[PDB]
Coordinates of C-alpha atoms and ligand atoms in Angstrom, one line a residue:
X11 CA 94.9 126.4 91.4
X12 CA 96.3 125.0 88.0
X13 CA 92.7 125.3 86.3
X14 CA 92.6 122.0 83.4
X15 CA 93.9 121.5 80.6
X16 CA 93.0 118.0 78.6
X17 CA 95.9 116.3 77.6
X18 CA 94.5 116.1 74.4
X19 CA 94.4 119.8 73.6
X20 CA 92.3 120.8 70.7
X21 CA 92.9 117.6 68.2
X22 CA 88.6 116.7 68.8
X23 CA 87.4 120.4 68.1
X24 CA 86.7 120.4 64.6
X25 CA 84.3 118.9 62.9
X26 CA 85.6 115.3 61.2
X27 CA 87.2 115.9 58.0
X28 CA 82.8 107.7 49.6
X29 CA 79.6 106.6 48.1
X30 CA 81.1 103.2 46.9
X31 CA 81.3 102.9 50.4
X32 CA 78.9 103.1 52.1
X33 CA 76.9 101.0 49.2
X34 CA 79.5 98.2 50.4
X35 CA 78.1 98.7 54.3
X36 CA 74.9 98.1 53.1
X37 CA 75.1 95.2 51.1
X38 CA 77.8 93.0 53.2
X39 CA 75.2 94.0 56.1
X40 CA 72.2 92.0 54.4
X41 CA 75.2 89.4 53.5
X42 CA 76.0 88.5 57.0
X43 CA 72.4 88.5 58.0
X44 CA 71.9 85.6 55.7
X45 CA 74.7 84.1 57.0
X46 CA 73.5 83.9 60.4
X47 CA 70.1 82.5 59.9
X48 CA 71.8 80.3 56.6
X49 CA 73.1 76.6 58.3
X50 CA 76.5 76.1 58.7
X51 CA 78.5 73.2 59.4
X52 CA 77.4 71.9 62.6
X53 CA 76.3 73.5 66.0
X54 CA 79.6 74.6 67.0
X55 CA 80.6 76.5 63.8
X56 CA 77.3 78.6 63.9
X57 CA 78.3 79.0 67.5
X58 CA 81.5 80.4 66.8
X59 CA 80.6 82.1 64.0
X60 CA 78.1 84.3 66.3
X61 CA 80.5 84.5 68.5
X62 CA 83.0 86.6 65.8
X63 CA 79.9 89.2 65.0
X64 CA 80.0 89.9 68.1
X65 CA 83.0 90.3 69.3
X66 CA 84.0 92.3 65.9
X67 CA 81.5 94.9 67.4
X68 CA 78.6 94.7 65.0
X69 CA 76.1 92.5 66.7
X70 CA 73.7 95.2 67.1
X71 CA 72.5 94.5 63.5
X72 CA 71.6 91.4 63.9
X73 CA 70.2 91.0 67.4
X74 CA 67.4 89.0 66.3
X75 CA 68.7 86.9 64.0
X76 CA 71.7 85.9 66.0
X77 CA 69.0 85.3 69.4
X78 CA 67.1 82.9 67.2
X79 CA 70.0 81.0 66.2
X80 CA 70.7 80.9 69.9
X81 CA 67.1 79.9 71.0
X82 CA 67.2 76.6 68.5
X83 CA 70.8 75.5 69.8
X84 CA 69.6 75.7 73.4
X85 CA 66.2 73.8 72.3
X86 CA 68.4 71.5 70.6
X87 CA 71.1 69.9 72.6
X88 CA 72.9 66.8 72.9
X89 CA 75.0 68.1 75.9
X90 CA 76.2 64.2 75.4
X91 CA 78.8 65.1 74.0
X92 CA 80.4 68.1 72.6
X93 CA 84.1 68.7 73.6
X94 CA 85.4 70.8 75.9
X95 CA 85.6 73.8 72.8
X96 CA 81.7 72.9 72.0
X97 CA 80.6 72.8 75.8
X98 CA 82.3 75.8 77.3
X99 CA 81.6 78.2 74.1
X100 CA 77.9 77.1 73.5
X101 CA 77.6 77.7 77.5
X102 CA 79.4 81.4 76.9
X103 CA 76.8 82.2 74.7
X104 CA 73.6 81.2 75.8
X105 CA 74.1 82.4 79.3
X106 CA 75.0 85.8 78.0
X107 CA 71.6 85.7 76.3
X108 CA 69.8 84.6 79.8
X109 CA 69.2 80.8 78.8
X110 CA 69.7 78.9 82.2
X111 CA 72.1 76.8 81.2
X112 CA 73.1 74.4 84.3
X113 CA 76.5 74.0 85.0
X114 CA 76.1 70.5 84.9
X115 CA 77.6 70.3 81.4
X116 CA 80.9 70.8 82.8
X117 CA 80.5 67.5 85.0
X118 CA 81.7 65.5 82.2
X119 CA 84.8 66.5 82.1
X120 CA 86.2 65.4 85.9
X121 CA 87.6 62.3 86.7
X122 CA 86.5 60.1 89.5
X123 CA 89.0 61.6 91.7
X124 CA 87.7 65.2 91.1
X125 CA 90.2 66.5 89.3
X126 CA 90.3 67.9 85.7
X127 CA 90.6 65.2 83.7
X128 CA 94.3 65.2 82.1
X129 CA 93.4 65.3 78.5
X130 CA 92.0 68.3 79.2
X131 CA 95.3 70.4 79.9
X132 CA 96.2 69.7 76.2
X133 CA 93.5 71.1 74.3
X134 CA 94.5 74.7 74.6
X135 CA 91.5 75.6 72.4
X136 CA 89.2 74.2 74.6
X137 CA 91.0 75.9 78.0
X138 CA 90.6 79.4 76.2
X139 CA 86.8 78.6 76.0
X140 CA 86.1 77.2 79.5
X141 CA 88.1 80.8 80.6
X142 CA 86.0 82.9 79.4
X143 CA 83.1 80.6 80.2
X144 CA 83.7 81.3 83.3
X145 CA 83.0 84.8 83.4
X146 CA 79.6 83.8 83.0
X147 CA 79.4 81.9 86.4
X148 CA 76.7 83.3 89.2
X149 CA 76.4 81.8 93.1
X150 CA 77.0 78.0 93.7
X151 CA 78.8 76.9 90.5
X152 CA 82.1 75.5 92.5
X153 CA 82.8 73.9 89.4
X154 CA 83.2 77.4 87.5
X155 CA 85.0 78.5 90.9
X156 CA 87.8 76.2 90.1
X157 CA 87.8 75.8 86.4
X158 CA 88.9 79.7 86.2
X159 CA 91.9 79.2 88.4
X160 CA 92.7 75.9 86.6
X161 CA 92.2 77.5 83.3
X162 CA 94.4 80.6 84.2
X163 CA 97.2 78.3 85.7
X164 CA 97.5 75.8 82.5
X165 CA 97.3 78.8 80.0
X166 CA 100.1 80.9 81.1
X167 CA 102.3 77.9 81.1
X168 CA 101.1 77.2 77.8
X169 CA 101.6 80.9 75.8
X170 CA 105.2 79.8 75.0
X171 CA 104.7 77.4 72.5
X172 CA 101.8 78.6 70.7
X173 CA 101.6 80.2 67.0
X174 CA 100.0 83.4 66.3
X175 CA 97.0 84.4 66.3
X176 CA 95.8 81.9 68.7
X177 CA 99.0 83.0 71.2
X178 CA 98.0 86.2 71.0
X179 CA 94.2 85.6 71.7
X180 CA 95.5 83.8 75.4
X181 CA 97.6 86.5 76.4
X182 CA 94.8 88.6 75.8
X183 CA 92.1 86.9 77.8
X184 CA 94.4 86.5 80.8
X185 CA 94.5 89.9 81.1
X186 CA 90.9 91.0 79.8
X187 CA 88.2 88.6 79.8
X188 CA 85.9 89.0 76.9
X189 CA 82.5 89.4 79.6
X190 CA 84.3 92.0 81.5
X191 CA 85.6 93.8 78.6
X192 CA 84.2 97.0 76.6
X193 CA 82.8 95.9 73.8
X194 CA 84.0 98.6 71.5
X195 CA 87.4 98.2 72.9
X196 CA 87.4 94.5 72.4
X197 CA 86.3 94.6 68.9
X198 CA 89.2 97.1 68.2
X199 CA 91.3 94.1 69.0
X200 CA 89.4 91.2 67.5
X201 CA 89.1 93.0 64.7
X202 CA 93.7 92.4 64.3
X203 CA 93.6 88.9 65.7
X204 CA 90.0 88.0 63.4
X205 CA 92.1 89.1 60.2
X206 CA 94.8 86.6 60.5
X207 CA 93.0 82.1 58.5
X208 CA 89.7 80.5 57.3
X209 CA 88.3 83.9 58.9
X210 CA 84.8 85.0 56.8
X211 CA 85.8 87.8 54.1
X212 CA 82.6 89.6 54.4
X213 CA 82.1 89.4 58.0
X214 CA 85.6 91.0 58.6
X215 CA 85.1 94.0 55.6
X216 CA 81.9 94.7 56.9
X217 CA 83.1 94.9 60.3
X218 CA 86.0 97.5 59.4
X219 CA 83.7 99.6 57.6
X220 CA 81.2 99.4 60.2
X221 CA 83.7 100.5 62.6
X222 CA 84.9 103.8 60.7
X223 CA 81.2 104.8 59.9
X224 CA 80.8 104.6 63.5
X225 CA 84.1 106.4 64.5
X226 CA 83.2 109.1 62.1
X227 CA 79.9 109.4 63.9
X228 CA 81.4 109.9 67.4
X229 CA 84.1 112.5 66.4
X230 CA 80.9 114.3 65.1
X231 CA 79.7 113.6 68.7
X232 CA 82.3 114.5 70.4
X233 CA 82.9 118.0 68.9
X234 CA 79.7 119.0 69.4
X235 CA 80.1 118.7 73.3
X236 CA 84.2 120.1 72.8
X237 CA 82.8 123.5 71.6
X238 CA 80.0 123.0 74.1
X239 CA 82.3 123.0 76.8
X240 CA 84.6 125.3 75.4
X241 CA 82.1 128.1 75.9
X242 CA 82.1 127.5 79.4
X243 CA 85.4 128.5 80.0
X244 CA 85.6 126.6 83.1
X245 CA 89.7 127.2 82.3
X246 CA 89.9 130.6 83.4
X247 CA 86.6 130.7 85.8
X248 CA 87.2 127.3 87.1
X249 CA 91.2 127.0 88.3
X250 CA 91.0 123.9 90.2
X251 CA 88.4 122.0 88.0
X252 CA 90.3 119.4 86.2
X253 CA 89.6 118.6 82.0
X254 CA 88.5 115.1 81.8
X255 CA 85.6 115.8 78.8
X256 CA 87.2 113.7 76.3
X257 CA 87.8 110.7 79.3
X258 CA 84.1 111.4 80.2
X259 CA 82.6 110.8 76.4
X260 CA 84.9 108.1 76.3
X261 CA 83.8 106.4 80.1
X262 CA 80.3 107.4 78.2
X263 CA 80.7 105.7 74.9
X264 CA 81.0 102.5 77.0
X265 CA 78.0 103.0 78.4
X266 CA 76.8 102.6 74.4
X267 CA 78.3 103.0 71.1
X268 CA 75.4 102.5 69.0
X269 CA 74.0 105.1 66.8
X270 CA 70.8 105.0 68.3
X271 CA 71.9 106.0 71.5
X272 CA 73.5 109.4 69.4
X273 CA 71.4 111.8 71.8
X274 CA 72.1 109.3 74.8
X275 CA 76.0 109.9 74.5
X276 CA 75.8 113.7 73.8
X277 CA 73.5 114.2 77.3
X278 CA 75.1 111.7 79.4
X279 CA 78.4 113.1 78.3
X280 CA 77.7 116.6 79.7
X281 CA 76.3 114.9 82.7
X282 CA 78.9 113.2 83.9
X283 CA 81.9 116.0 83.1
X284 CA 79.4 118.8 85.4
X285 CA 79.8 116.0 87.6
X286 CA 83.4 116.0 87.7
X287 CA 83.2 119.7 88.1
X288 CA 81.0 119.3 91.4
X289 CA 83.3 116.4 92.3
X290 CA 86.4 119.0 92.1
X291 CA 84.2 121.5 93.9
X292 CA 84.0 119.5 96.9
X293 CA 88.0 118.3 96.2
X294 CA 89.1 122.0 96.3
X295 CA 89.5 124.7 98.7
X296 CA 86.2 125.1 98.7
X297 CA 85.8 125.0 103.0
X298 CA 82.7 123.2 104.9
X299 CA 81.2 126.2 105.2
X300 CA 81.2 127.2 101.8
X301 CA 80.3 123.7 100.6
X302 CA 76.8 123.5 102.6
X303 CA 75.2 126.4 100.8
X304 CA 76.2 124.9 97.6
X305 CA 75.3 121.3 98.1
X306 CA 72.0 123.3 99.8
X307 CA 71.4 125.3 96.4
X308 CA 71.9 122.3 94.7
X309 CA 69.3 119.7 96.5
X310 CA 67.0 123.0 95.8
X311 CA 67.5 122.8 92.0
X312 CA 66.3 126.6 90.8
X313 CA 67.7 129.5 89.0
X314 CA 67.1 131.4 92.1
X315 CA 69.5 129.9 94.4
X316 CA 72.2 131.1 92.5
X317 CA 72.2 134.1 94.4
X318 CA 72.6 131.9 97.1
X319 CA 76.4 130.8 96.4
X320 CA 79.7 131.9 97.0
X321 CA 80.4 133.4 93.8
X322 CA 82.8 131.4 92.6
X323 CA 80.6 128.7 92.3
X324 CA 78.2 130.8 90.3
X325 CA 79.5 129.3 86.8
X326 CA 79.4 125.6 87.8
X327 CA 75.9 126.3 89.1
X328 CA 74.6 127.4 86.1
X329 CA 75.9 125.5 83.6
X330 CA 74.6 122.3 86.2
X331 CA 71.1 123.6 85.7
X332 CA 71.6 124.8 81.6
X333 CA 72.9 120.7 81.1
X334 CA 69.1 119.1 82.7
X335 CA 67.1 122.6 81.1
X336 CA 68.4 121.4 78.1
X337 CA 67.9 117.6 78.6
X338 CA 64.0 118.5 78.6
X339 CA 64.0 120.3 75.3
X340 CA 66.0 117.5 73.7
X341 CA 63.7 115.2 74.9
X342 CA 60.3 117.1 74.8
X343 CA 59.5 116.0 71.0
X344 CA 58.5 112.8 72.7
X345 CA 57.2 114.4 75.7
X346 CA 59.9 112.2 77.8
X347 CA 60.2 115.0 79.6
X348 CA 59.8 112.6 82.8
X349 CA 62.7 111.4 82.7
X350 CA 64.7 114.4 83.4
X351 CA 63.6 114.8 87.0
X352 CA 65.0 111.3 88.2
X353 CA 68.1 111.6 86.7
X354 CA 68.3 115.7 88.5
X355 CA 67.2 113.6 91.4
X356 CA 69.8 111.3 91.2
X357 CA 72.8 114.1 90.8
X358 CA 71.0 115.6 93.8
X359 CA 71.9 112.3 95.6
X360 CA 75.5 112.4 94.4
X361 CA 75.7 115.9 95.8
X362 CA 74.6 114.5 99.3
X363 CA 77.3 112.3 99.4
X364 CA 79.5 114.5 98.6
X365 CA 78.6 116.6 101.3
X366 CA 79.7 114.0 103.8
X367 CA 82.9 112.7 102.4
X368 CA 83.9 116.1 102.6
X369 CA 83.3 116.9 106.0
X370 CA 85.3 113.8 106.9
X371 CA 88.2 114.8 105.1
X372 CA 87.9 118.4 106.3
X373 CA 87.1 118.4 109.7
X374 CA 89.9 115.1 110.2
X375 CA 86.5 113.1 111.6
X376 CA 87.8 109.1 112.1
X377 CA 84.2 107.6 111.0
X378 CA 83.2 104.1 112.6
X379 CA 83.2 101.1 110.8
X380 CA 79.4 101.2 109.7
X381 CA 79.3 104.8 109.6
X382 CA 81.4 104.7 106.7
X383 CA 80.1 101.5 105.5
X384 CA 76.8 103.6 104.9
X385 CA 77.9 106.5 103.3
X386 CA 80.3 105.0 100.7
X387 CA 78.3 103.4 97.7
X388 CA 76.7 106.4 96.9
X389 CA 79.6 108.5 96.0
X390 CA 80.0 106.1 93.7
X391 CA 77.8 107.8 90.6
X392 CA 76.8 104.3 89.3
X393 CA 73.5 104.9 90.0
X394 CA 73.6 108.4 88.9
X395 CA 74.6 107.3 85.1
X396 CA 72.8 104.4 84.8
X397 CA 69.5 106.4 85.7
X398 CA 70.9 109.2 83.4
X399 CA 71.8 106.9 80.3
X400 CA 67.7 105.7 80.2
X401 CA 66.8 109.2 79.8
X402 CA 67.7 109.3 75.9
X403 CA 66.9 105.9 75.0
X404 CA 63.7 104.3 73.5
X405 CA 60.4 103.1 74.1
X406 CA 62.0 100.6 76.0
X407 CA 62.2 102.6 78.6
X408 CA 59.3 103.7 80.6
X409 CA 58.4 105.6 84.1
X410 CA 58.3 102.3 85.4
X411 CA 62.0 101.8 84.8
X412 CA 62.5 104.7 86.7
X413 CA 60.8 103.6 89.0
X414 CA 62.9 100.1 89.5
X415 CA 66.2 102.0 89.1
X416 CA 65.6 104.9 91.8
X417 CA 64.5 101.7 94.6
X418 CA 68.3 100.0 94.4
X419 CA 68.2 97.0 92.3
X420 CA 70.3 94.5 92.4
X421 CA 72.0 95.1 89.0
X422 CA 72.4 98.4 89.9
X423 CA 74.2 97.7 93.9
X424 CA 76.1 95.0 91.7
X425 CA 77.7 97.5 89.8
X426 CA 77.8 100.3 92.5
X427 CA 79.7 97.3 94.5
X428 CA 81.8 96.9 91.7
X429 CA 83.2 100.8 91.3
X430 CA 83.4 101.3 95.1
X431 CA 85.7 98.7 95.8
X432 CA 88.0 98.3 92.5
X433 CA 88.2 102.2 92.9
X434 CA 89.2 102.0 96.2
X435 CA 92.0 99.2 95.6
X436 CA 93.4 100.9 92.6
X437 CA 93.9 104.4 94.7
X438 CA 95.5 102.8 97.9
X439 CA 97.6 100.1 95.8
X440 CA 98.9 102.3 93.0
X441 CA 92.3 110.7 102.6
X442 CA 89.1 108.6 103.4
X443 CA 90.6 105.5 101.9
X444 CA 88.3 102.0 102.2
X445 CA 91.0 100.0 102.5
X446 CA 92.7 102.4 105.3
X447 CA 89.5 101.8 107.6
X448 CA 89.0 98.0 106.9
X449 CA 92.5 97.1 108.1
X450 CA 92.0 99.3 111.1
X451 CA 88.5 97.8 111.7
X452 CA 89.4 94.3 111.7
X453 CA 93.1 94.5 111.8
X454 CA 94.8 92.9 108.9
X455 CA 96.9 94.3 106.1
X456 CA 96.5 95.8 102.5
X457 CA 97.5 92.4 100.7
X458 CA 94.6 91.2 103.2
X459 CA 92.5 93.6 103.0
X460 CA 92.7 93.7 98.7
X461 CA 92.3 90.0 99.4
X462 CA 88.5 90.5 101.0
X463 CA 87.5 93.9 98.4
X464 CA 88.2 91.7 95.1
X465 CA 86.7 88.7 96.8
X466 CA 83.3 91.4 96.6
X467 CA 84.3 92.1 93.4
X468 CA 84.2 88.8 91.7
X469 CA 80.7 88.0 94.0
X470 CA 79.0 91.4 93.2
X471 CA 80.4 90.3 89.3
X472 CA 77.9 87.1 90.0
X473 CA 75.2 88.9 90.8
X474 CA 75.0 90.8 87.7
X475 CA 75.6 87.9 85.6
X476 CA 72.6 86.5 87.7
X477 CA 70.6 89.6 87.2
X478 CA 70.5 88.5 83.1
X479 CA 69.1 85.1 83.5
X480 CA 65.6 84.5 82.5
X481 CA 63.2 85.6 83.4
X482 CA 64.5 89.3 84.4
X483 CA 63.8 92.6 86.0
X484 CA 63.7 94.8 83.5
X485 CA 64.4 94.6 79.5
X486 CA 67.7 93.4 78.3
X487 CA 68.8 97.1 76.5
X488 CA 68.1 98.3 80.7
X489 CA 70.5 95.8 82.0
X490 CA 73.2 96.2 79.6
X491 CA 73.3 100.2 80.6
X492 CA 74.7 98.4 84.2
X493 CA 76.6 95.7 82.8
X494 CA 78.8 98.1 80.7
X495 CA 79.4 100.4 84.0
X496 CA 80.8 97.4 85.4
X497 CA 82.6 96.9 82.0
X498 CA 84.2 100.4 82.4
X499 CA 85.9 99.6 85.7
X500 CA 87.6 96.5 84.8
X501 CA 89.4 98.3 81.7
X502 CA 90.1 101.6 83.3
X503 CA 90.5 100.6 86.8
X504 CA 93.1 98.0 88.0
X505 CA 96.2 97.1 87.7
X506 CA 96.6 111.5 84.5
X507 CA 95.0 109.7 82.3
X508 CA 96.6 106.2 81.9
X509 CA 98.2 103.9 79.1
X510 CA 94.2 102.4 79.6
X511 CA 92.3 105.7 78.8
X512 CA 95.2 106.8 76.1
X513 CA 95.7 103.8 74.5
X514 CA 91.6 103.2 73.9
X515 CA 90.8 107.2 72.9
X516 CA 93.2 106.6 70.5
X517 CA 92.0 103.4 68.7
X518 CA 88.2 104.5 68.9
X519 CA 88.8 108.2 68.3
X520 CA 91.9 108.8 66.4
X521 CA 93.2 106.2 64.2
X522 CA 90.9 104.8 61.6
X523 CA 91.0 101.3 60.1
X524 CA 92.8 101.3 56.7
X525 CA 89.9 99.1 54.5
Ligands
LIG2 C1 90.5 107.3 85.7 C2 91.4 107.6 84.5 C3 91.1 108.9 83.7 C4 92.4 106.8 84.2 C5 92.8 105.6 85.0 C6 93.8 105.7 86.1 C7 93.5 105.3 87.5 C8 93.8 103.9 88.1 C9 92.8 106.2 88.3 C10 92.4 106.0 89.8 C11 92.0 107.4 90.4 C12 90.6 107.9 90.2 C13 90.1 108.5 88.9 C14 89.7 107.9 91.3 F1 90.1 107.3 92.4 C15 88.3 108.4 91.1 O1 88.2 109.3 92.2 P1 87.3 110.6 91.9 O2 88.0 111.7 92.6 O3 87.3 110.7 90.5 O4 86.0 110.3 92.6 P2 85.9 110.1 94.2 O5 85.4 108.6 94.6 O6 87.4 110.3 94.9 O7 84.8 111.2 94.9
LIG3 MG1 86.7 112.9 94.1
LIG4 MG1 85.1 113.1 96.0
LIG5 MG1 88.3 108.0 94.3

């Protein structure tokens, strides 16, 4: 066809490229530890003051410190009474956490009728709060239900009068929610709106520094996997495979930014751009009949097979088996070898799918409501990177998480629920199309039809909030790999490679933060 190119050309190639520094970083680091566990005012400012380090992005340092703070605020309540501010941001927080936090502590603030009280539509502050509060709500909290419509109604009649930065905080959260949102993306942005009064000088240096010593880390990342795949040469060899590496590391570095998870981005990130290739593979003029000895040589997993292939599938063969080969020597100097063979399992799963999406679009095969219905969450790749993102993390991980992910949690449906449908949405608003079989199925149109997908959205959004509420399935650094999948559909998918994917490459990976 047209084989690649990235938009982005060669700019991430290269390698990237002060001892004063760095000796700041470490000092304001031990400086806002102290003040997290130091007292501040009351409740609420410790509350909000959390809050900040983590939304500026550098909560990571502090996870214990800032959970103890949390654990004695949730011991130690007088729900009667904060205001609405207090309520809704001390609610945010702790459910975040997994405290189980009723939703009673919103009763307060209806009048007899059952209405929101009318004070309550003046304290902007306090609306702001109980939105993104509300992002926090699981199954049978009616009062969240409505709060987030209320909340959304009063506060875009409300931007007009307010004064910077608080104006620009609301329009933000009415079009990105703080829960939903990628956390390095996010603290990008608090990190403009945090510098404008009263705002904690330390907290805000440390934060920009923290945020360059990171960026300089992933353009170190990221060029190591650029010459990686440059090697391939899947440009020449590879004409209809698209060049979506940088989106992939980028999609990646959402599933985790931290240092630690250094080897995590650099494996998953190969991962999921041979994935594309494969996707494109079965999105080309690759035939059926071409396609089952591939997906056939694939399920098999082994050098030998490769004899097996049409031979222009040779190259994306290899390299599919050179990415996991190399995955177990990366990983063998902790003999998690283990791991490898769930996460080959679950591409092998991928592949599957892919096999019989294809034959639908190919042989022009109308599947039945529930025949489709079965097949469509697993070309979703959900599973597939979550499972994938465990194989370079910690002792935290063990073959028993494995073991939970490959069964189907409900974290990981949740978040397979949550790419199927918002994918599906975003391709028919803006062949084998959800949407297209649900209004033939039960008759009704798009606007209809998006109606009952996002309606699955926002419940499947419960569920995972659910899934983090004490006591839980599996450690909280498990669940977050999930949670942030989710995270990268709400920024990148709704309403090439978009303003979205653009405008965040550039303020993570280009454009550093002038100290
Ligand atoms: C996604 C980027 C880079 C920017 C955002 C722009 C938008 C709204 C893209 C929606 C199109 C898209 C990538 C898909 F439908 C994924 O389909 P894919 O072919 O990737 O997987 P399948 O589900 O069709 O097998
Ligand atoms: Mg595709
Ligand atoms: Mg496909
Ligand atoms: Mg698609």
């Amino acid at each position: 066809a047209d084989f690649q190119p990235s938009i982005w050309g060669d700019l991430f190639l290269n390698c990237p490229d002060d001892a004063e520094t760095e000796k700041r970083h470490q000092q304001l680091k031990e400086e806002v530890r102290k003040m997290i566990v130091a007292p501040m005012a009351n409740s609420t400012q410790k509350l909000a003051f959390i809050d900040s380090v983590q939304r500026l992005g550098v909560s990571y340092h502090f996870t214990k410190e800032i959970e103890d703070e949390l654990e004695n605020i949730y011991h130690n309540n007088n729900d009667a009474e904060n205001d609405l501010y207090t309520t809704s941001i001390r609610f945010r927080l702790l459910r975040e956490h997994g405290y189980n936090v009723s939703c009673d502590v919103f009763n307060k603030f209806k009048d007899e009728q059952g209405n929101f009280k009318s004070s309550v539509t003046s304290d902007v502050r306090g609306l702001l709060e109980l939105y993104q509060a509300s992002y926090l709500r699981v199954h049978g909290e009616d009062i969240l239900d409505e709060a987030i419509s209320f909340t959304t109604h009063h506060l875009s009649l409300a931007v007009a009068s307010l004064d910077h930065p608080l104006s620009e905080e609301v329009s933000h959260a009415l079009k990105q929610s703080i829960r939903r949102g990628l956390p390095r993306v996010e603290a990008r942005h608090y990190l403009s709106v945090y510098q404008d009064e009263s705002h904690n000088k330390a907290l805000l240096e440390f934060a920009k520094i923290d945020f360059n010593m990171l960026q300089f880390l992933h353009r170190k990342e990221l060029s190591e996997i650029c010459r990686w795949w440059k090697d391939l040469d899947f440009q020449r060899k590879l004409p209809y495979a698209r060049d979506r590496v940088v989106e992939g590391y980028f999609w990646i570095s959402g599933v985790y930014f931290e240092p630690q998870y250094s080897l995590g981005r650099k494996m998953l990130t190969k991962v999921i751009a041979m994935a594309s290739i494969v996707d494109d593979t079965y999105d080309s003029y690759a035939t059926y009949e071409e396609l089952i000895p591939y997906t056939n040589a694939i399920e098999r997993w082994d050098i030998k097979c490769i004899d097996e292939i049409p031979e222009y599938m040779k190259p994306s063969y290899k390299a599919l088996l050179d990415v996991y080969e190399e995955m177990v020597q990366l990983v063998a100097e902790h003999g998690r070898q283990y791991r490898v063979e769930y996460a080959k399992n679950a591409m092998i799963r991928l592949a599957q799918s892919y096999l019989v999406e294809a034959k639908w679009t190919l042989q022009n095969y109308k599947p039945s409501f529930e025949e489709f219905k079965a097949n469509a969450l697993p070309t979703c790749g959900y599973a597939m990177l979550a499972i994938t993102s465990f194989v370079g993390m910690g002792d935290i991980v063990t073959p028993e998480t494995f073991k939970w992910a490959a069964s189907d949690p409900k974290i990981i449906q949740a978040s397979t629920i949550i790419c199927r449908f918002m994918d599906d949405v975003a391709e028919h608003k803006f062949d084998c199309s959800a949407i297209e079989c649900y209004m033939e199925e039960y008759g009704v149109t798009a606007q209809e039809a998006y109606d009952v997908f996002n309606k699955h959205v926002e419940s499947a959004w419960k569920d995972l909030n659910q899934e983090f509420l004490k006591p839980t399935e599996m450690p909280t650094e498990v669940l977050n790999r999930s949670l942030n999948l989710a995270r990268v559909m709400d920024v990148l998918y709704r309403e090439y490679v978009g303003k979205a994917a653009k405008g965040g490459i550039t303020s993570l990976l280009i454009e550093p933060i002038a100290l």
